[PDB]
Structures are given as C-alpha cells and as structure tokens.
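Researcher: Let's walk through a ligand-bound prediction step by step. First, I give you the protein sequence. Second, the SMILES string for magnesium ion. Third, you return the three-dimensional complex as structure tokens. Ready?
Model: Ready.
Researcher: Here are steps one and two:
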Amino acid sequence: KNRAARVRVSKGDKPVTYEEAHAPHYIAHRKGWLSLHTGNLDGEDHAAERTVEDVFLRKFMLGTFPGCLADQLVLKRRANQLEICALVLRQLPPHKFYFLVGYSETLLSHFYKCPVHLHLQTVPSKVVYKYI
Amino acid sequence: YYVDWKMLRDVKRRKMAYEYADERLRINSLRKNTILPKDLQEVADEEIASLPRDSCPVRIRNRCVMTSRPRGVKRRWRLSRIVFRHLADHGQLSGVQRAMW
Amino acid sequence: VDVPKDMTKPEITISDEPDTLYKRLSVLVKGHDKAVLDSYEYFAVLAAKELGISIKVHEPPRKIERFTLLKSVHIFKKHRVQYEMRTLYRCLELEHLTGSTADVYLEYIQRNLPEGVAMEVTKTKLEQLPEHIRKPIW
Amino acid sequence: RRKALPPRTEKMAVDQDWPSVYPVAAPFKPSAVPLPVRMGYPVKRGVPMAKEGNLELLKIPNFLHLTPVAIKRHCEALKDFCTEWPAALDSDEKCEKHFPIEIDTADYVSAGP
Amino acid sequence: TVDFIKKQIEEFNIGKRHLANMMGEDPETFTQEDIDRAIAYLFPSGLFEKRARPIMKHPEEIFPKQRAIQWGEDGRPFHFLFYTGKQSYYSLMHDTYGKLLDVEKHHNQLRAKDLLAEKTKILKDPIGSRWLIKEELEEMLVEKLSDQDYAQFIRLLERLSALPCGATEEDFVNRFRRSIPIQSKKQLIEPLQYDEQGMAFSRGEGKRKTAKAEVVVYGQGSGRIDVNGVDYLLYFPVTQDREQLMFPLHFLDRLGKHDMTCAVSGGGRSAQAGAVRLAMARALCSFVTEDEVEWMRQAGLLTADPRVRERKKPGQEGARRKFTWKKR
Amino acid sequence: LAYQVHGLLNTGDNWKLIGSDHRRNFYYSKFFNLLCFMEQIDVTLKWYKDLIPSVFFPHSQTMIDLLQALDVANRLDMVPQIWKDSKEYGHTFRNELKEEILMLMARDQHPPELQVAFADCAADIKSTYESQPEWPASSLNYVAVLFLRAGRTQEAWKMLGLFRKHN
Amino acid sequence: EEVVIPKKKTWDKVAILQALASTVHRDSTAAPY
Ligand SMILES: [Mg+2]
Ligand SMILES: [Mg+2]
Ligand SMILES: [Mg+2]
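Model: Step three, the predicted complex:
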C-alpha cells in the first residue's frame, strides 16, 4: 500500500484537517502548494536554496510557537521578500504573540538577508474537515 | 554539526578545491597545451601532482544536503530521492506534483 | 466624512536628453497554475489600456517536465513514482513605446507580479546609427 | 482571559471603496473580507468549507488589491510619469528609414534574496 | 438548520452587494455569471478539479435539500404514510395507483355508454422522450430510493400510460417525462468559397498520429495533387500512400475533376498519407450532395483515427510488453 | 478654527505633526468634544465612526460628550450602538460613567418600537452587575419605566425584586 | 525633419510608489496598520 503522507482511517473518531485528508496524488487537483516560489519553473535557478530555506522555516516556526501552530505553514516568495502565513490556535496572550511576531521577523530578516513578513491568522481550535 | 563525518570530509574537500582552483587551472593550462615544450610540461606535471590530494575536483561528491545520502540525488534540489519525495508528497515543493498522463 | 486635505506631492523632472524609444517590448510571464496567469493577463491588459500602450497577448505552448524516482526506501525497482513540473506561459507584446512609459508600466507590472510566477522582459530599442559610421569612410 | 471580537465585515459599509481596504499585496485575512466565499472540496452531504480558518484560501494568490477600480485610480495617478510617442513613427517603414538599428536586451525577475 | 439558511442568504445578498461594489458594477444587473468572473479574477485557483475551486453561490444551490419537520409540536406526524419510513415515495405510488383506478372506472363507464373517446399519447418518440433516471426521481422526492422501488414505480407508470389517457392523467405522467437532447450525426457542411475571381475552392483539415494536414481543393481544375509544393508521386513513393490519397476521390468518382494543394507536417509517411486522406475527404464535402456525405461517413472517410502511440510505463518495457517474469 | 487646524494637520505630513500617543489622544478628545455638541447630529454621527474605532480610542471625556450630545438632539436610536462600543473600549471607566449613561433613558418618551432596545441594553447591564458592582436605583427607574412603555410588568417585578435583594 | 523625439522624465526611485500611495486614502473600519 501507499503510505506516503497519509492519515490512516481510525475507528472513525479522528479529527482531520483539509490538508491531511488528501494524499499526494491530490496535489494540484484538490489541495494546492504550501510553498510558492519561482525556482521550480522551467528556466529558473536556486531551487535548492529555496528548499533548504523552506525546511528551516517550518522547523523554526514550529519551535518558536510551541503548541499553538494549527496547520502547516504557507510560504509566499515575491521579489526578494518572503511572507509567512500561519494558522495559529489561541493559546498565548496577544503580548507574547506580538513579541514573537517581531522577534521572528527581525531574526529571520537578519538571518536570510531579506525582508520577512509574518501574518498570523488566529483560530479557536483546529479546523476539522473530516471524521470527528 | 554536518549530519555525518562523510559530509564533513566533503565540506573540507570543497573548501580546499575552491582555494587551489587558480593554481590547478594555471598549471593545467601548461599541461594541456601542445605548443609548449615537453620539458616544461613534465615539471608542470610534477607541480600539479605536488598539490594537496584533496584539492582536486574529482574527489568531490554531490551528497544529499539534509540526509547526507551519497547517491540517488536529484541535482536540482541537491536532495536524496527519499527526502525529496517526503517534501514533495506533503505539498512543500512548489510546482512539483504526481505525474498522470 | 473625514478627508485629509492636500494629499498629493509628486516629483518629476524633465532632462533635456532624447528619451530612449522602444520599437517592441515583449513581457513573458512563466507560471505554474493557469488561473493566476489569466487574472494577471487581465490586470496587465487593463493597466496597458489605461495608459494607452496598445498591446497584444498570446499564449506560448506549455512545458511539462517529467522525472522518475524509486517508490521504495530499499529494493523494488519495478516500482516508481513519477513527478511533473508544469510551466505555463503568457506573452504580453507591447508596441511603439517610449522609455518613460516603459519604466512606469514595467515598474507597476513588476510590483504586482504574483509569488509563484516569473517574468522575462525582451526590449528591442531603436538607435539611429553610431557616430564613427555615419558617413565617414576611415 | 479570552477575547473574541466580531470581524471587520460587521462595520463594513455597503458602498465603501474596496482599494482602501487592500492597498497592497495581502495574505487574505478572512476577517477583513466581506464576501462569503466557500472553497475546498465538499463532503458527500456537506458543502465546501467556509472562509474562516480555511488554509486553501490562504494558499491562493489574491488579486484583491488589483480590483479594476484600483487599476483605474492607480493608472490615472501614473499618467503623469509617461511621455508621448512621436506621431510620424506610426509605421515600421519610417521606423526603418529613420532608425536602422535594433538593440535587444533581456531583463529577468525571479523571487529570492 | 433553517436559521442557518436564512443567515447564509442574508450574508450572500450583503456579500453580492460588496462584490458588485469592488468590481465596479451595478449591484442590480449582477448575475451569477458575473459573480463567477469576479471570483475567478479575485481568487485565481488553478486546480484541475472544478469543485475544489472558490465559490460564492446562493445557499440553496450550495446546501443539499432538507427533509422538512415530519410532525407537529404534539408529536403527531403530518402525513398519514409517515410510519412507512418512506412517506414521499409511497405517497407517489398511492396517488399513481389512485389515478390508475380512476382511469379504469371512467373508461369502464365509457365502455358501458359505447364511447371510446380517447387516444394513445404513449408515443412521444419523435420528441425524444424518456423516463426520469433514478437520480432524478430521488431528487424530486427529496428521498433516497432503491432500484426495485424505481422499477416498480416506472412499471406502474407504464400501466397508466397504456390505458385511455385523461387530461389530468397525461399532465401527471408528464412530470416524469424528460426529453433526450438533439440526436443528429449529420455533419456541418463547409460553405463553398469563391476567392480572387477563382471559383469553387473548399478547405479541410485532417489530423492523424503526430501528422497535421491542411488541404485546399479546387473543383475548377483538372486532376493533380501538390503536397508541400511537389507532385504527389514524388512526395509519396510508396504505392499504398497514393492509394490512400486516391480513396476518397475514387469513392466519389471525382478522380479527374479536382485540383488540390496540401500542407502536411509531422509523423511518418503513412501518418501523412492518412492525415491528407482525412483532410481531402473533409474538403470534398462542400462539392458533393448531402447523401454522399453520409456515404463517405459510412465508409469511414470523415472520422479522425483516434489510434495513437501509448506511453511507456515504469517497470515494463513497451507500455504493454513486460519484463521477463521468473516463477522460481 | 478646529476644522482649520485639522486642515493644517492633514496637509504637509499629518503623521509627522504629532509626537506622542498621549498628546495624540488629547487632540481627538478635545476635537471630538467640539464636534459632538457644536455640530448637527448629521456631522457628529458621521465623524464618530471614522475617528473613534479607527484612529484613537475614547477616554471618559469623549464618553460623556456623546451622552450629552444625544440628550439635547433627542436621539434614542443610537444608544445601543454607542453602549456596545463603550463596552469594548471603556471597560475600566464603566462604574463611574454608567450613572451618567443611564440618566438619558428617563428624559425621553418611549414608543412601542423602542421597547426591545431598552430591554436588551438594560438586561445585559444588570445581568453583568448581578453576577459579580454597586447598582443605582436610577437603573431600576429605567428598567421599570421602559418596561411600562413596553407593556411588560413581569420582568420589572423580578428586577425590583432583585434590587430589594441587594440589601 | 519628420523625426520627433520627446525628452525623458527622470524621477526618484520611490516616486511611483508614492504616486500609487496617493490614490489610496485611509480606511475607516480598519485597525492600525
Ligand atoms: Mg548516523
Ligand atoms: Mg564523482
Ligand atoms: Mg516493443
């Protein structure tokens, strides 16, 4: 059987996001891409760099916002600037949320040598597509 | 930490080979030419073989960037097929998709 | 109700120099998904009709790159996974433009380029003749 | 202490000019957008998911800053920077008779550092 | 779930006003079409599945039909057939059988009075009339059905329509009529074209197997064919290919009467012969009578040949051919 | 001359012309203080929705001004709205300016259409201070009178009951 | 003689961005940017 990026059927109680509810053969058909950048187009360069950046960004954002991260990150790259769009549970007081917004934006702007935008969309609890 | 000792050894190889690139190019210019006398190219041969062993480009290995895998690498992402597929199958590689035709 | 008064302060100067002429300007937008290139072509054509730049648009044939990997971690070579990359094209062909209009239109357009698309600009510019060639002979 | 504030769509006037809300390229916050929009695959009985908490609408490039009214206004503000094209040059014949030489130059834009 | 639909319609109207405002259009003349263009522009999702794309539509179209409340606040069900567990379907059957009984009674009274005044309306066949599918019936009653249920119902309708038809009865069985759309396979004749004092030239375009052919035929000329600027005897050295070019002309007995020029690209020699054959056949349909067009279609001249190279598959050799399979 | 000062601010650079946030809210406190009483309700209700939630948020001084602006022009329609906004911005000031807010409910005469507005606005209030908040008898004058113009005796009874339970 | 050329308008880098910022006024229902 194909195990790739699949959430196996449970006893029927298992809450599932729209994201996790669709296997790899459904990309570009039903679910879209979690990253947007030019580097994978036909005549273009530095796909490798954008990829390693991507990975580090997911890992980093997951570690910087413990427990409040709802869905997988959305990374949009436009003309040297990267906008990170995130779905975030309401856990921390807005004080901590802003603290980490600024801290992260600054830190990654100085790390990757480009302007970093961070857009937080807050949601009460994980949005459920299926089962449950 | 580079994921493996092997990855470390290859980072050192790429640094050394980047450093001596000029020397090697200039000497192998003499060595690869018919116009110059043989007496010059023999001394130039001993000169380029004198150079540190780890500075020559044929000892460099393209390895998976994340996982260190010595082969089964897609050069464009510098990724092992395994790691590549992992990333692509989660929708994390823009424009990449399963192929139906 | 509340209207800020005297909000405009543009800065433009006119140099005495003979502004560069462009016989034809081709803008080629490569993209992954079609709909984005459609709304972008609509936006670009509208922005060109508002500046009276007189443009045509056509669609260059799409390019699909396919490649094959092993499905298994260790050993089954009979089994593979096949992956695609689809690059789609829009070509905006503008004709009879000046240098200033070219830089304004290209600035406006390039600011509004979507994250997943790339753009190639081929400008064919008009120059009369070089000085040493005009009608001297050596 | 838990704080839930009703979305912008409540205070939104029916005729309020749109380009005021989305001046620049934006992520699509669902609170700031008045239109109900259901995207995502449906379920057998059910409908496509709402606009709130929907990640798929977040993935989409949105042309909301580029709404045709905003293009009219923008381009009317850009009419000042553009310089006119010479009359007599209207046909390619006179283009060749006057300027013999074409210099082709390529400029590329790609996202990244 | 009623408050839900009320709210959804409120916010759909408000949102349609907003969308009409930003798109710069009259909120009154805004249609579903315009809504579609609007969201297609504002949220441009390339996705191959069209049901996964952004949608703002009237809540009645989006949400599925709801079974209404089946009883009063005292608990007593509204309909008398409620406890059947299918009230809609068995109501339908009760009334259908009631009307079949009615037809039998009325028509028997008219048998005793020496009157058969009715006619058979049972043949609607030129209208292309058919019954509902099970899906349509299922949608009409807002209730799930079984194959035997639908078959039962339909059979009872056949019992009804096979008798003398009343007015109310005809109108009744005509809810359950659908009309199959236009059935004609007749081709669309290329209007003949007169160009630069030259008379009667027709065009046709064949496509076969990586090979495209554009054929212009003149009815005013003698027999010859020029393919890519050269004679057909030169371009097609193989006899088979010239016979392929000869097929439609010999079929219509036009062999000496027409003069043709062709542009054919891609594929091999036989693929080109076939593409030109098809193009030529489609070009000769302007010069001939409407009957011989049907004759050419029935000889297989006018249909493109769908047969095309299949893609090689991984783990196999030839897209069919498999690697050698070892038992032990 | 305040229209004039505002025309001056917005002109060269409006943003560069005010240094701090305290000295910024002074500006709108006093400016809207003028706008509310000195101008017709058509102007005040208008500049209201533009200045208050968007730029800088109401203090107690701008809180009392709306109250005195709706008593003179006889506006009973805008009480639920301004109350719902003052709830959002004005949580701490509540106890002190409340007695002032409610006093404008006596001054009016109440048609059969406005009953439910009074009912809701007062019920949220008194369900807030009975679940915790010294509560004035004025508020009961209001619930009871507004419920007399409403035609509802039964709730006014339970509210008089809830004040005589307040010792 | 029929040949006519206009002159070039040299503007500052940020100029077009500020000319676009002119066509957008301030949003009423919006919180601080
Ligand atoms: Mg290890
Ligand atoms: Mg090697
Ligand atoms: Mg074979």
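Researcher: And what stands out?
Model: Strands of chain E lie at 129-131, 177-179, 193-195, 198-208, 211-218, 224-227, 230-231, 259-265. The interface with chain C takes residues 40-42, 44-47, 314-315, 323 of chain E (CB under 8 Å).
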